[PDB]
Every structure is written in structure tokens, then in C-alpha cells.
Amino acid sequence: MRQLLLISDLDNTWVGDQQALEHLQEYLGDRRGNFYLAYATGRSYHSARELQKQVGLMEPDYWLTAVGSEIYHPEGLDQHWADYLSEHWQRDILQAIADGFEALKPQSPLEQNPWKISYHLDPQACPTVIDQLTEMLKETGIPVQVIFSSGKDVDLLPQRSNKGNATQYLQQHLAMEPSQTLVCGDSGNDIGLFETSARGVIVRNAQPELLHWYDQWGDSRHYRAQSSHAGAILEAIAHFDFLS
Ligand SMILES: OC[C@H]1O[C@@H](O)[C@H](O)[C@@H](O)[C@@H]1O
Ligand SMILES: [Mg+2]
């Protein structure tokens, strides 16, 4: 029903360069009816909302928050997505395992939710510890996923979650094709978006994990932008000739 499904992360992607953000929102504001907009952020809904007030984020159609662990529709939280993410999820067990790693420190309570267990990796600790955590957690047989971004943030989510799986769920809900979709990201918590078959753009200021990911899995649907922050989205839109 629209020609584009724009999905983007906020911090360091849409947000970061105020001028680029404003001229991106200026362009989009002249063709608002031609696209669905969804923010796929690692922030909680309340936190994303607070960011909107600070930088003046244009009202999106959907909010895919906490790395896609929660989906907000114009009319409210998606309870189907929640129940779907709840099947076979054993938060307490996974948390007990992760809490036992000396190199991991729990992130603040407000960063946690029923489908998201987050920690910070010690800056002095060896990153291979994430690999050990991942192997240990998966051997529990509990459908879990490990997200590592900015060499510091660790997120434990159900396998069914991901900014990418939430995206595919949204595409199906909106009857939008991958070819009509554009995902934008900067870090390891956006890899799930690029695993999707949608067109994607990696901001110039992308984190090391994402750049390394691109080097190995990058395909022709993946565009590595020269512009950083919001500028990369305008650039990608021109590249894939979207909003023709
Ligand atoms: O997803 C990676 C990180 O993104 C941040 O935006 C969230 O506040 C944090 O909880 C998470 O660990
Ligand atoms: Mg990100």
C-alpha cells in the first residue's frame, strides 16, 4: 500500500548528526504517505520516546524496541509478538548462567525486560568470553540468541526476537516485500537486520563488529555508505532508487 518500509536504528544511525537528521526528516516529510517508518532500537520504548523529544524524531508508524523484544503499533503494544517470544523462553535459567561470568556486569534494571537480559563486558576482559557464554547458553537447549555490540553491550534474547526477525514479522504484517524494505544500522545489534533479505545500508560510522560482518556476509543488497548517520539513509534511498 506504500512503496517503502524504512527501518532504522536510532543512536549513531538516525540520531548523531543533527543537521543530517533534520534534512533527512525534511525530505521524508514531503512524501510522508509513501512509506511506513519503524525505529528498530536497542532502547526501551520509554527511552526511545524520550530521545524523540530531545532530537525531534519524526513520528514513526512502528517502534521495534529493546532489540526487537517489544513491538509497538500505533494503537499499542503487540501482545501476539510478546506471547510468541514467550514460548520456550527461560529467562531465569539463562540469567543464572550469564550472572556467573566474572567479566559480565548486569546493565541497569531499566535496560531489562521479560525477553531481554543485558550486561556490559569488562573493558579489560577478553572478548572470547562472549563465545564461551554463547556456547554455554545454547547448550541449555533454550532457544536463546546472543547479541554483542560496540565491544561492550551483551544482550540475551529469544531466538525468535532480533531487529531482523521483528522486521520480517512487520513486513508480513504490512504486506511489504523485502525489495521494498530498507534497513539501516551501525552496530552488532543491527546484524539481524542485515541477515534479512531487505535492502540495507551500513552507516560510515559503523562499529567494528558490523564492518567485520559485512566483509564476510555482505551481499549485493547490502550498501556500505560514505555518509555517516542520517546522511547514509538519504544516500541509500538514492542508491536503491527508493521513493522513485
Ligand atoms: O542492544 C545493544 C544495547 O543498545 C542500547 O541502546 C540499549 O540501551 C542496551 O540495553 C543494549 O545492550
Ligand atoms: Mg545499533
The best mutation among 108, 111, 119, 130 to test binding of ligand 1, ranked by most ligand atoms within 8 Å of the C-beta, falls on 111
Question: Whose C-alpha lies nearest to ligand 1, atom 11?
Answer: 42
Query: Binding site residues for Mg(2+), as ranges?
Result: 9, 11, 186-187, 189-190
Query: Ligand nearest 68 Cα, by number?
Result: 1
Query: Binding site residues, as ranges?
Result: 9, 11, 186-187, 189-190
Question: Whose C-alpha lies nearest to ligand 1, atom 9?
Answer: 42
Output b/e per residue, 173-182; b: 16+ Cβ within 10 A: ebebebebbb
CATH-assigned architecture of domain 89-159 = Alpha-Beta Complex (3.90)
List 156's β-bridge partners, or say none: 117, 146
User: What share of residues in the chain are helix, strand, coil (percent, to 5)?
Assistant: 40, 25, 35
Atom number of ligand 1 nearest to Cα 67: 1
Resolution number, Å: 2.5
Coil/strand/helix, residue 8: strand
Q: Please state the domain extents for the chain.
A: 1-88+160-244, 89-159
Q: Can you read off the three cell numbers belonging to residue 163?
A: 531487529
Question: Whose C-alpha lies nearest to ligand 1, atom 10?
Answer: 111
The best mutation among 118, 154, 157, 163 to test binding of ligand 1, ranked by most ligand atoms within 8 Å of the C-beta, falls on 118
Output b/e per residue, 194-213; b: 16+ Cβ within 10 A: bbbbbbbbbbebbbebbeeb
Answer whether 127's CB lies under 8 Å from 151's CB: yes
* Strand order through the sheet with 62-65: 76-77, 70-73, 62-65, 35-40, 4-8, 181-185, 199-202, 222-224
CATH classification code of 1-88+160-244? 3.40.50.1000
- Residue in the structure block whose three cell numbers are 567494528: 208
Q: CA quadruple 145, 41, 200, 204: dihedral positive or negative?
A: negative
